[PDB]
Design a protein around this ligand. Structure first.
Ligand SMILES: Nc1ncnc2c1ncn2[C@H]1C[C@H](O)[C@@H](COP(=O)(O)OP(=O)(O)OP(=O)(O)O)O1
Ligand SMILES: [Ca+2]
Ligand SMILES: [Mg+2]
Length: 430
DNA sequence: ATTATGACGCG
DNA sequence: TGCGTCATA
């Protein structure tokens, strides 16, 4: 009743760039614009591995993780842009720098949480309050929401997509109570107006298009964002949740796409997020733990409290290289050469980071994978990062892992290494 | 698929 | 103030 929290206290958006690495390459090379194209990493094995795909190429069935040779079978005219290679490895600097362009624009509107290279959460609660005070009970025009979908609408008593979008928006706006500054639906609507403005600024100032979700928390905002891609935004209201969740596979919700989500499905014998409402909080805690159980109990009702963290910069700076099949490092000299390449890239990125962001990493984390281990990581060890010097970091990394070598011969390495990973962490102000 | 980030548990 | 695992981009 009057004491039941509905999780409508915040306005949260998630902005996610459309096919991000592709847009970065299309900005740089106009010949790629408005074409089926993909970004590929390396070239020797099966034409290279695809890591990003334009919407035109997706129509042919091209996907991330596909080898380029196989993608060409589906889309013979597919254009390809290669990730830069430096010091023997893929180097992602262009995309990291493009990400900074977008994050800096978003930060003008509100505090953001960098969630990945191409997406950020925004807590718009305060910005919405401010905008509502300027509006002064003035209605919100559909013209202020030219790319917004209202999930669940139209409904009740045109066969084209834009027509449906407008119909739903009209129904939503007609029902809005602009009189009440505390109305959560109104708050979301104003949030959506702000997000249109943010998205326009991103496109004007960078050339890049994006999609966004607007809702009352991060999980719903992330879900919302994916409902209408690309180049569109979606408002998921609290009232839209029962219908939305009634046919929503559990795996679609952030954090439930893996083993936990599979366990929810198997243990409870359900398929859709909505079906979770039929269990008590204690029942859910009994299967999935105190924390997960409480989270699921609220989440299936559209309620989540995880804050948008005030963090625009990554907390770690890392680089890594796999050594597949035949290339597994079987000599000490090889292990040392690659550790040096990684350390040189790391030194370059750290030195730039220190100058830009007034901070210094204090810990170096070294991780390896050994041949035969199905685990993505076989071993992790750390040491002090006291100087931004590639030679010192590579030597320190070796020292930390050299004991992993079973080889009797001092020159050889066994068992061969299938991966090396160096990561700088534990930043302190400088 | 390879090269990344970030959270959480304490087999 | 370590390390392994999970989940995601
Ligand atoms: N598994 C991966 N390995 C390497 N790079 C990845 C991987 N997943 C994503 N990326 C990179 C390339 C992407 O352009 C960028 C952002 O990823 P993501 O948001 O998942 O898709 P996207 O931006 O390419 O398309 P979409 O329009 O569907 O968001 O990060
Ligand atoms: Ca994206
Ligand atoms: Mg993304």
């Amino acid at each position: 009743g009057p004491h039941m929290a509905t999780g409508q206290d915040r306005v949260v958006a998630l902005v996610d760039m459309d096919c991000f690495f592709v847009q970065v390459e299309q900005r740089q090379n106009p010949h790629l614009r408005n074409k089926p194209c993909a970004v590929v990493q390396y070239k020797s094995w099966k034409g290279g591995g695809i890591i990003a795909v334009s919407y035109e190429a997706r129509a042919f069935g091209v996907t991330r993780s596909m080898w380029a040779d196989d993608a060409k079978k589906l889309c013979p005219d597919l254009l390809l842009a290669q990730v830069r290679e430096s010091r023997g490895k893929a180097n992602l600097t262009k995309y990291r720098e493009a990400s900074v362009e977008v994050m800096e624009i978003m930060s003008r509107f509100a505090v953001i949480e960098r969630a990945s290279i191409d997406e950020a959460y925004v807590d718009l609660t305060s910005a919405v309050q401010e905008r509502l005070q300027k509006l002064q009970g003035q209605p919100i025009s559909a013209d202020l929401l030219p790319s917004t979908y209202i999930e669940g609408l139209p409904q009740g008593p045109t066969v084209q997509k834009e027509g449906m979008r407008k119909q739903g928006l009209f129904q939503w706006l007609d029902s809005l109570q602009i009189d009440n500054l505390t109305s959560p639906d109104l708050q979301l609507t104003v949030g959506a107006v702000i997000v249109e403005e943010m998205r326009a600024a991103i496109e004007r100032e960078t050339g890049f298009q994006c999609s966004a979700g607007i809702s009352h928390n991060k999980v719903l905002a992330k879900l919302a964002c994916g409902l209408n891609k690309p180049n569109r935004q979606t408002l998921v209201s609290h009232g839209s949740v029962p219908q939305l969740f009634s046919q929503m596979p559990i795996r679609k919700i952030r954090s439930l796409g893996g083993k936990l989500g599979a366990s929810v499905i198997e243990i409870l014998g359900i398929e859709y997020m909505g079906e979770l409402t039929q269990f008590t909080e204690s029942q859910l805690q009994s299967h999935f733990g105190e924390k997960n159980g409480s989270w699921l109990y609220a989440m299936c009702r559209g309620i989540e409290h995880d804050p948008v963290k005030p963090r625009q910069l990554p907390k770690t700076i890392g680089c890594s290289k796999n050594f597949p099949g035949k290339t597994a490092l079987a000599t000490r000299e090889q292990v040392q050469w690659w550790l040096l390449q990684l350390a040189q890239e790391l030194e370059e990125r750290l030195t730039k980071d220190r100058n830009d962001n007034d901070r210094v990493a204090t810990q170096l984390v070294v991780s390896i994978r050994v041949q035969g281990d199905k685990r993505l990581s076989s071993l992790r060890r750390c040491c002090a990062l006291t100087r931004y010097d590639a030679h010192k970091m590579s030597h320190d990394a070796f020292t930390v892992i050299k004991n992993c070598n079973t080889s009797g011969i001092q020159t050889e390495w066994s068992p061969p290494l299938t991966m090396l990973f160096l990561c700088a962490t534990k930043f302190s102000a400088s």
